[PDB]
From a paper:
In order to obtain structural insights into [name], we crystallised the full-length protein comprising the amino acids (aa) 1-570 (Lem3FL) and a shortened construct (aa 21-486, Lem321-486). We solved the structures of Lem3FL and Lem321-486 at 3.6 Å and 2.2 Å resolution, respectively. Lem321-486 differs from the conserved PPM1A fold in minor details: The central β-sheet core consists of two additional β-strands (β1 and β19), thereby broadening the cleft. The spatial orientation of the additional α-helices forming the thumb shape a deep cavity located at the interception of the fist and the thumb (referred to as the hollow region). The base of this hollow region, which is located closely to the β-sheet cleft in the active centre, harbours the metal ions. As verified by CheckMyMetal, these metal ions are embedded in an octahedral cluster which is characteristic of the coordination of [name]+, Mn2+, or Ca2+ ions. This metal cluster is surrounded by a scaffold of oxygen atoms provided by the side chains of four aspartate residues (D82Lem3, D105Lem3, D254Lem3, and D394Lem3), the backbone carbonyl of a glycine (G106Lem3) as well as six water molecules. More precisely, M1 is coordinated by D105Lem3, D254Lem3, D394Lem3, and three water molecules. M2 is coordinated by D105Lem3, the main chain-oxygen atom of G106Lem3, and four solvent molecules. Additionally, the effect of the mutation of D190Lem3 was examined since it is located in close proximity to the metal ions, suggesting that it could be involved in their coordination.
Residue numbers in the entry: 20 to 148, 164 to 330, 352 to 363, 377 to 485
């Protein structure tokens, strides 16, 4: 469809003691789902959350992600609204608490998509009559200007904008506020209407976007497992994101991938994030068993966990009773090509062939550029089921090759005239 939003998901979360013998493949397969809109927008959603020695029977995913694809008056795709939310609190083993937190997480996301206003007006309408952080954006083609993207981040979500060669252009950074007693927690969408200092909480950027730009939104469950970087710290505020050099290396794979799906991009980041998460939790329980041998290298390992006077007994209780991981969600969007979307509309809506025919002349500089457009459309893949387990993904061609070839021949003939 044009509108897709993740549904309430309750999974069985095995303990670290059970996951400590499992490979990455098994860990991902039991914990993550693919929610697909098209080749150019996909969601991966799941939970890496685990107790050291106890299984979590009802592990409710408190993250939501959603998209509404928008069209011009002719029905040609020209924009989208995208939101990712992280419900604050929960994961304690109370279903009533998790249900309440999920309702706010989901409605926050849903309300953002259903609003038809610019981002600043949208945030005002959905923040007036349980907390959730939100990272969200609106892009739209403005005939004179091209694509303009409005970006909003409240809390510890993260948005990264790349070009078509996976060069990092912009980052809408995560935020933590100091709460006292050495603890930093993200602001919520709901906190925005309770204070005059909306800047201190709301990160806003308005950006010109190019065709084929990649926008990645992640909850801290995904990007927090990658190598992180402190961007800035004031008195009571921290600006945090991914190490840009490390994040760039994640795409080394796709360097020669002709037109990679949003799914493939999301999968690669999710795999690396959960690899580090799985190895992190392997190390912890083995270190715990290693420092139980003491009976009161490893030093740099023990140092790395704690620092990124407390009595030994308290630390061990902490490490042995600790939950690891979190609700982990990522959405990936490709900014559409003007020519590709006009061709999509021409094929899907052959009734509107007269109205669309005049628009091709402006969007076709050469036959080479037409061939480029039909090449991208040739490579588009869709998940016939909107949702399925990440390891049970089945993808088929968006178009019949024979349909694309006949349309290209017709359009090529008319260009050559
Ligand atoms: Mg949360
Ligand atoms: Mg989170």
């Amino acid at each position: 469809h044009d509108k897709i939003i993740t549904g309430k998901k309750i999974i069985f979360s095995q303990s670290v003691a059970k996951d400590q013998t499992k490979n990455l493949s098994s860990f991902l397969s039991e914990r993550f789902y693919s929610v697909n809109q098209s080749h150019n927008h996909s969601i991966i959603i799941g939970s890496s959350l685990s107790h050291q020695e106890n299984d979590i029977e009802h592990d409710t995913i408190l993250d939501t992600s959603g998209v509404l694809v928008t069209t011009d008056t002719n029905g040609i795709v020209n924009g989208a609204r995208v939101a990712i939310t992280d419900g604050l609190g929960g994961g304690n083993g109370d279903q009533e608490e998790d249900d309440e937190i999920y309702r706010v997480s989901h409605s926050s996301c849903e309300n953002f998509l259903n609003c038809d206003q610019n981002i600043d007006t949208t945030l005002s309408l959905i923040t007036q009559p349980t907390e959730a952080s939100m990272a969200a954006f609106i892009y739209q083609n403005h005939p004179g200007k091209g694509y303009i993207g409005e970006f909003a981040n409240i809390g510890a979500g993260l948005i990264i904008i790349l070009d078509k060669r996976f060069k990092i252009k912009h980052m809408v950074s995560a935020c933590h506020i100091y709460r006292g007693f050495g603890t930093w927690t993200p602001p919520s969408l709901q906190a925005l209407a309770t204070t005059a200092n909306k800047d201190a909480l709301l990160v806003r950027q308005t950006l010109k976007l190019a065709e084929g730009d990649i926008i990645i939104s992640m909850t801290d469950g995904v990007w927090g497992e990658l190598k992180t970087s402190l961007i800035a710290q004031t008195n009571d505020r921290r600006d945090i994101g991914v190490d840009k050099e490390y994040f760039k290396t994640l795409f080394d794979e796709l360097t020669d991938a002709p037109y990679p799906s949003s799914f493939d991009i999301a999968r690669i980041i999710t795999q690396r994030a959960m690899s580090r998460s799985l190895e992190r939790r392997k190390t912890l329980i083995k270190l715990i068993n290693e420092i139980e041998q003491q009976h009161f290298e490893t030093a740099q390992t023990l140092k790395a966990i704690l620092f990124e006077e407390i009595p030994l007994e308290m630390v061990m209780h902490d490490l042995k009773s600790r939950t690891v991981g979190d609700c982990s969600t990522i959405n990936v969007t490709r900014i559409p090509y003007h020519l590709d979307e006009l061709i999509r509309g021409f094929i899907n809506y052959p009734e509107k062939h007269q109205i669309l025919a005049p628009l091709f002349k402006a969007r076709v500089k050469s036959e080479a550029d037409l061939e480029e457009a039909f090449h991208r459309l040739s490579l588009e893949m869709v998940q016939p089921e909107i949702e399925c387990p990440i390891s049970e993904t089945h993808f088929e061609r968006a178009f019949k090759k024979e349909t694309l070839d006949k349309t290209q021949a017709v359009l090529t003939h008319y260009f050559r005239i």
